[PDB]
Amino acid sequence: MTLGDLWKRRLNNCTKEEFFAYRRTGILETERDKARELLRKGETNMGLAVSRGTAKLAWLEERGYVNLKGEVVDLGCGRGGWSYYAASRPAVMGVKAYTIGGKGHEAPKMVTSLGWNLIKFRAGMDVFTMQPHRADTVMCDIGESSPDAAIEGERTRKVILLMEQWKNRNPSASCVFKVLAPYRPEVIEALHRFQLQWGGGLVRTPFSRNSTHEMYYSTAISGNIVNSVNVQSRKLLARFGDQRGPIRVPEMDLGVGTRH
Ligand SMILES: Nc1nc2c(ncn2[C@@H]2O[C@H](COP(=O)(O)OP(=O)(O)OP(=O)(O)OC[C@H]3O[C@@H](n4cnc5c(N)ncnc54)[C@H](O)[C@@H]3O)[C@@H](O)[C@H]2O)c(=O)[nH]1
Numbered sequence: 135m136t137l138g139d140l141w142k143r144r145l146n147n148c149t150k151e152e153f154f155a156y157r158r159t160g161i162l163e164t165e166r167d168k169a170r171e172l173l174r175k176g177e178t179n180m181g182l183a184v185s186r187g188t189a190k191l192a193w194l195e196e197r198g199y200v201n202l203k204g205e206v207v208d209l210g211c212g213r214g215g216w217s218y219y220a221a222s223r224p225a226v227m228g229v230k231a232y233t234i235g236g237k238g239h240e241a242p243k244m245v246t247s248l249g250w251n252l253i254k255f256r257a258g259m260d261v262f263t264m265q266p267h268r269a270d271t272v273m274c275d276i277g278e279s280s281p282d283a284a285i286e287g288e289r290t291r292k293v294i295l296l297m298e299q300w301k302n303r304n305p306s307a308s309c310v311f312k313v314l315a316p317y318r319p320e321v322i323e324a325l326h327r328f329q330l331q332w333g334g335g336l337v338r339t340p341f342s343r344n345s346t347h348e349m350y351y352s353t354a355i356s357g358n359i360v361n362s363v364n365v366q367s368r369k370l371l372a373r374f375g376d377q378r379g380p381i382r383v384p385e386m387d388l389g390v391g392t393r394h
């Protein structure tokens with residue numbers, strides 16, 4: 135059993151008051167007051183982020199931890215926060231975005247965020263059974279939390295396998311993908327094998343809530359996997375009892391318009 139396995143059990147053992155005090159303490163959170171209601175009322179002329187994912191991918195790129203360029207594929211795009219971010223980047227030429235949609239899952243939000251015309255959204259698509267195709271950059275933000283750590287580990291392993299398939303088709307592709315439960319031994323093993331073939335490493339973004347152990351894998355960085363996960367598990371355990379709240383920051387506004 136890992137330190138992160140312990141963290142998950144301690145999290146599940148929290149009272150509701152302990153859970154509410156823990157989940158957001160010390161984390162960056164974008165101010166979504168205006169974006170949330172523009173999306174609810176169906177406004178489509180807006181460049182404010184459609185989801186909290188946009189700021190996370192922006193942080194990774196600004197840190198230099200991901201390379202977004204060329205033909206981008208967004209696997210499990212949900213509302214599309216990563217697709218709209220990639221579409222606004224000058225080095226990106228097009229985005230093919232796929233997501234399952236349907237009951238309980240998010241469909242793409244349709245807005246005129248800068249470069250929207252370069253995105254081809256396809257909902258109703260299961261990326262785990264879809265044949266890979268050409269891509270310069272492969273992005274995947276898939277991983278639904280579960281109180282059951284074995285389920286989180288299985289969901290994570292499926293994403294790593296998916297990324298191996300896309301790398302087999304595109305050995306030179308830049309990759310960035312969510313690793314929902316890096317604290318599971320079977321995820322660490324699958325990640326180590328990915329690293330030995332393709333390079334890369336793991337990083338925690340400051341927007342992730344303390345109630346999730348999610349980290350992001352990118353071929354553009356390096357680092358011992360076991361050390362990265364353990365450092366993060368210690369940080370998550372250290373925040374139990376912290377009284378500070380979230381740090382509020384402005385939401386990303388990409389502006390509106392086409393790219394040609
Ligand atoms: N001690 C608690 N831990 C919680 C709780 N809610 C979530 N969590 C943990 O955070 C993890 C991430 O939570 P997330 O950000 O995805 O929030 P959600 O509400 O969308 O997660 P769900 O699992 O779908 O929650 C649905 C209901 O499940 C309840 N729930 C979920 N886990 C718990 C636990 N462990 N104890 C008590 N109640 C729990 C929770 O109150 C909700 O009413 C989750 O997997 C759990 O390990 C919680 O209420 N109490």
Ligand SMILES: Nc1ncnc2c1ncn2[C@@H]1O[C@H](CSCC[C@H](N)C(=O)O)[C@@H](O)[C@H]1O
Nearest residue numbers: 185187210212214215216234239260261275
């Ligand atoms: N097998 C699958 N095939 C396609 N989409 C899937 C999938 N499994 C989960 N998904 C979708 O993947 C999404 C991951 S969350 C998407 C967040 C996105 N990066 C943003 O910034 O908005 C969810 O909407 C889920 O419905």
